């Protein structure tokens, strides 16, 4: 089972206005499409600098999101293909759920079994039979031979997990990941969009790899099925999602959550810009900004915090920085036994 998480590198900056206008006229009135595409072509100004935006879209437009959600949809038809997209979406009179199929045969009739595009980050889950995986590997290696076994060099991995819990860069598994990524990249024309290997992660689960890794919506997720490498189905650990099979109603897998490094860095930078822009500012405003940021992070993750042991240190360090800022505001000389009241 191979999962490819990636993102269209510069979709916003590469949406051709004429093609976008045609695609919008496909779905909306030509007057509305012309208005939207003309609104996307205006003079961008900043201080003394100004130019005209004639290639990309302007994301500050109120309807721009719609455009993105439309343009990315087209990319899905380029990735999934019309047949698989129709199988996923179901019949037009009986639309399917988010992750469901009308029949089991439709589910098992294509390598691509799960897909979610989000805004620009596509997560795809393929299930490959040994013959299909071997055929894809040979097809990829036909035009990309690797006598030196160099496919392991640039293969991205989720370093936040230990070596055993990480993805294991075995030769066959790495070859399959590269083959899957190359197959996906070949579908999308290089001009309408593109997928970059460096800014993407492919994780495969096989006999060699027991853990299925990915990252979505700031969550570093790892599924370890109970069948193979679950010594104990512990429930006390509250940062672990306990996946269940809806048919057997039995314990089958186990999901470990973790806060992504990018989310931690974003929170740290938010606290930094709270602190550094706090010279002639009231203590109440600084504490309110800190509280808002902290409650946003903690109520967004709510489980990935406990497993991310680095996030706890980051949070307490940021709290100490805020309290030190307040104390320095009160008096230049730092206190020795300042109270928490």
């Amino acid at each position: 089972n191979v999962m490819l998480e990636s993102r269209f590198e510069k979709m916003y900056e590469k949406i051709d206005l004429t093609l976008l206008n045609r695609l919008l006229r496909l779905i909306v009135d030509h007057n509305i499409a012309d208005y939207m595409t003309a609104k996307n072509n205006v003079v961008i100004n900043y201080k003394d600098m100004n130019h005209t935006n004639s290639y990309g879209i302007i994301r500050g437009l109120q309807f721009a999101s719609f455009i993105v959600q439309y343009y990315g949809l087209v990319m899905d038809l380029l990735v999934l293909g019309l047949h698989r997209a129709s199988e996923m979406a179901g019949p037009p009179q009986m639309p399917n759920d988010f992750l469901s199929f009308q029949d089991i045969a439709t589910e098992a009739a294509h390598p691509i079994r799960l897909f979610c595009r989000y805004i620009d980050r596509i997560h795809i889950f393929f299930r490959f039979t040994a013959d299909e995986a071997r055929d894809l590997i040979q097809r990829y290696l036909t035009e990309h031979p690797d006598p030196n076994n160099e496919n392991i060099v640039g293969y991205n991995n989720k370093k936040c997990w230990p070596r055993d819990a990480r993805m294991r860069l075995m030769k066959h598994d790495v070859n399959l990941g590269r083959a899957v990524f190359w197959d996906i990249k070949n579908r999308l024309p290089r001009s309408v969009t593109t997928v970059q290997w460096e800014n993407s992660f492919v994780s495969v689960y096989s006999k060699d790899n027991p853990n299925l890794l990915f990252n979505m919506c700031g969550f570093e997720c790892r599924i370890l099925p109970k069948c193979r490498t679950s010594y104990e189905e512990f429930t006390h650990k509250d940062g672990v999602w306990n996946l269940q099979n809806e048919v057997t109603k039995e314990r089958t897998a186990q999901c470990f959550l973790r806060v992504d490094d990018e989310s931690m860095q974003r929170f740290h930078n938010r606290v930094r810009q709270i602190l550094m822009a706090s010279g002639s500012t009231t203590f109440t405003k600084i504490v309110n900004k800190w509280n808002t940021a902290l409650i946003g992070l903690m109520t967004y993750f709510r489980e990935a915090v406990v497993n991310t042991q680095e996030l706890l240190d980051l949070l307490v360090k940021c709290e100490n920085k805020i309290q030190t800022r307040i104390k320095i505001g009160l008096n230049s000389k730092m206190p020795s036994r300042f109270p928490p009241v």
Partner: peptide
């Protein structure tokens, strides 16, 4: 007594996150 916010990595790990919530 210092008042410094100490990290709870390994501290207060016995309790769940559902405690003290209704």
């Amino acid at each position: 007594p210092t008042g410094e916010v100490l990290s709870l990595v390994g501290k207060l790990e016995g309790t769940r996150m559902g405690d003290k919530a209704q």
